[PDB]
């Protein structure tokens, strides 16, 4: 569970959903997560870990 609902979501806050939106309790983390939609604890699990990609140009 988080510490902020879908209404009290301000700028520079975590937005990783927890639970089911069609459920009773559905909130977000709501922590210090500036310069990014998700938090630092979930930024490494959401995006592709170990980014290794390259091509020609």
């Amino acid at each position: 569970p988080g510490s902020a609902t879908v209404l009290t979501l301000g700028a520079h806050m975590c937005k990783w959903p927890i639970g089911d939106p069609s459920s009773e309790g559905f909130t977000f983390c709501g922590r210090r997560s500036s310069e990014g939609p998700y938090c630092v604890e979930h930024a490494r699990v959401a995006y592709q870990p170990q980014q290794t990609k390259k091509k020609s140009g």
Binding site: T52, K54, K55, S56, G57
Partner: protein, 47 residues
């Protein structure tokens, strides 16, 4: 062992070229070559 370069038979053209370039590491030369080939693109060591 210092050098063998006179001014009558051999020239210092190859040695002088090492003082005009600012690239030292191989990655620097690779990035410069990639920028010269594909201009206007962020070069990476992998590509």
């Amino acid at each position: 062992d210092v050098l063998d370069i006179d001014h009558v038979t051999v020239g210092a053209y190859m040695r002088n070229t090492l003082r005009v370039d600012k690239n030292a590491i191989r990655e620097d030369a690779l990035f410069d070559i990639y920028r010269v080939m594909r201009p206007g693109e962020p070069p990476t060591v992998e590509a």
